[PDB]
Amino acid sequence: ADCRVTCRFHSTYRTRSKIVRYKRTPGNRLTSLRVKKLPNAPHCAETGKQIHGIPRVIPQHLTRQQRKVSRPYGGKLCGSALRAHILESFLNEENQALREIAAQTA
């Protein structure tokens, strides 16, 4: 009939942390259950996009395998950024090799 719910926190001030979802308990009473802020997943250093593969849970409670991605530069970068960094390093070395080294020969 009435479902007031009162408050489950030290202070009533409803900040982003103090938000509560409501469920019915096994004893037929309404329970404020705190809904915590979902932290974001790691985001790529370049690009700024979310890195794929890591769940949005704090990395403290995410084991080691679930907080990692199997690639070189797996968590710092996404694949496309790494594919571009690799190519720059190969292409740039070869630019000195086919320009400055080719100039030494010619």
Partner 1 sequence: PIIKPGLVCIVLQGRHAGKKAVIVEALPHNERGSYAIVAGIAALPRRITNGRVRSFVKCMNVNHLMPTSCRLENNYKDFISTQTVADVTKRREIIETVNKDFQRRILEHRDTWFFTKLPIDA
Partner RNA sequence: GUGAAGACCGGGAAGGGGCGCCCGCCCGUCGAACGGGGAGCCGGCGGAGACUCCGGCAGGCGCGGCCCCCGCGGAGACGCCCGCCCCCCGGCGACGCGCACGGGGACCGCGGCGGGCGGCGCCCCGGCCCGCGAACGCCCCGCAGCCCCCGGACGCCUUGCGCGGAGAGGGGGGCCCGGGGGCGGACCGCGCGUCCCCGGCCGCCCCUGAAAAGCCGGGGGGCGCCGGCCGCGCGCCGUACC
Chain contacts with RNA (rule: CB under 7 A): 1, 3, 8-11, 13-19, 21-31, 33-43, 45, 49-61, 63-76, 78-80
CB under 5 to 8 A by kind: which of partner 1, RNA, none does 40 bind? RNA
The three-state secondary structure class of 48 is coil
**Burial category of 77 from C-beta neighbours within 10 Å (exposed 0-12, middle 13-18, buried 19 and up):** buried
Q: Does 87 bind partner 1 (CB under 8 A)?
A: yes
Exposure string (b/e) for 49-67, b if CB count within 10 Å is 16 or more? eebebbeeeebeeeeeeeb
Q: Which of 90, 99, 100, 105 binds partner 1 (CB under 8 A)?
A: 90
Q: Which is nearer to RNA, 72 or 106 (CB)?
A: 72
Flag whether 75 is marked binding: no
E strand intervals along the chain: 20-24, 30-34
Distance separating alpha carbons of residues 74 and 84, to the nearest angstrom: 14
Question: Rule CB under 8 A: which of 38-77 touch partner 1?
Answer: 45, 70-73, 76-77
Q: Which residues bind partner 1 (CB under 8 A)?
A: 45, 70-73, 76-77, 79, 82-83, 85-87, 89-90, 93-94
